[PDB]
Design an enzyme around this catalytic site. Sequence first.
Site, PDB file in Angstrom:
ATOM      1  N   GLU A  44     -22.196 -30.725   7.967  1.00 40.79           N
ATOM      2  CA  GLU A  44     -22.786 -31.859   8.901  1.00 40.79           C
ATOM      3  C   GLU A  44     -23.579 -31.157  10.000  1.00 40.79           C
ATOM      4  O   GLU A  44     -24.181 -31.894  10.749  1.00 40.79           O
ATOM      5  CB  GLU A  44     -21.478 -32.532   9.675  1.00 40.79           C
ATOM      6  CG  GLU A  44     -20.607 -32.933   8.505  1.00 40.79           C
ATOM      7  CD  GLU A  44     -20.859 -34.222   7.893  1.00 40.79           C
ATOM      8  OE1 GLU A  44     -22.024 -35.003   8.484  1.00 40.79           O
ATOM      9  OE2 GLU A  44     -20.200 -34.587   7.088  1.00 40.79           O
ATOM     10  N   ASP A  53     -27.983 -40.636  11.112  1.00 39.92           N
ATOM     11  CA  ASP A  53     -27.626 -39.749   9.987  1.00 39.92           C
ATOM     12  C   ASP A  53     -28.401 -40.263   8.847  1.00 39.92           C
ATOM     13  O   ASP A  53     -29.409 -40.815   8.879  1.00 39.92           O
ATOM     14  CB  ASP A  53     -25.984 -40.142   9.557  1.00 39.92           C
ATOM     15  CG  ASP A  53     -25.754 -41.210   8.958  1.00 39.92           C
ATOM     16  OD1 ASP A  53     -26.407 -42.236   9.109  1.00 39.92           O
ATOM     17  OD2 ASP A  53     -24.557 -41.576   8.454  1.00 39.92           O
TER      18      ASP A  53
END
Length: 162
Positions: free
Chosen positions: A11, A20
Amino acid sequence: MNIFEMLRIDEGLRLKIYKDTEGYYTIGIGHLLTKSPSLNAAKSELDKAIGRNCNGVITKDEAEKLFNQDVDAAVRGILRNAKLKPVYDSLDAVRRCAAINQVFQMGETGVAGFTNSLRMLQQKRWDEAAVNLAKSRWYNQTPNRAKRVITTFRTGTWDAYK
Ligand SMILES: C=CCNc1ccccc1
Ligand SMILES: [Cl-]
Ligand SMILES: [Cl-]
C-alpha cells in the site's frame, strides 16, 4: 517478513490525503477514508479518525497508528467470519499473511465471495486456487499486487516479496 512489512510494501505510505486506485479518499498506509467524492467528507473522516483537526495531513506515527488498528480489525474480521475462519485456520503462517492482505485490501465481504478459491485453499490445492483467484476483477484491476499475493498463496513463501 511479516504482515506489516508486507502490507507496507503493497500500500506504500502517504501523509496527505490521496486517491486510491479506485478513486477514493485514503491516507497513510492504505487507510480508506471514504467512498464519497467530497474531499471535505474526507477531511471530516480524517479528523474523526485521528481525533484532531488534521487539515488533510498526518504524521508518520499517526499513520502507523491507523495501520495497526487496521491490521487488527481485518484479522478480527476474518476470525468472526464463518466462511473465513475455518479457511484461515487451516493455513500455515505465511499463507495466512496472504489472507489478511486480501481482506485488508478488499473487505471481508469481497473475500467471502471467493467461494471456490476458499474451498481450494482449504483442501491445499495451491495451484488450483491460484488459477482461480486470477479469474477476478481484483486480479484484472491490480495485477501486480494481486500476482504477489497469489504467489504467496501458491508457494507458502515470501519469494514474491523478495
Ligand atoms: C480465497 C481467498 C483468500 N482469502 C481469505 C481470507 C480470509 C481467510 C481465508 C482466505
Ligand atoms: Cl481511528
Ligand atoms: Cl498492482
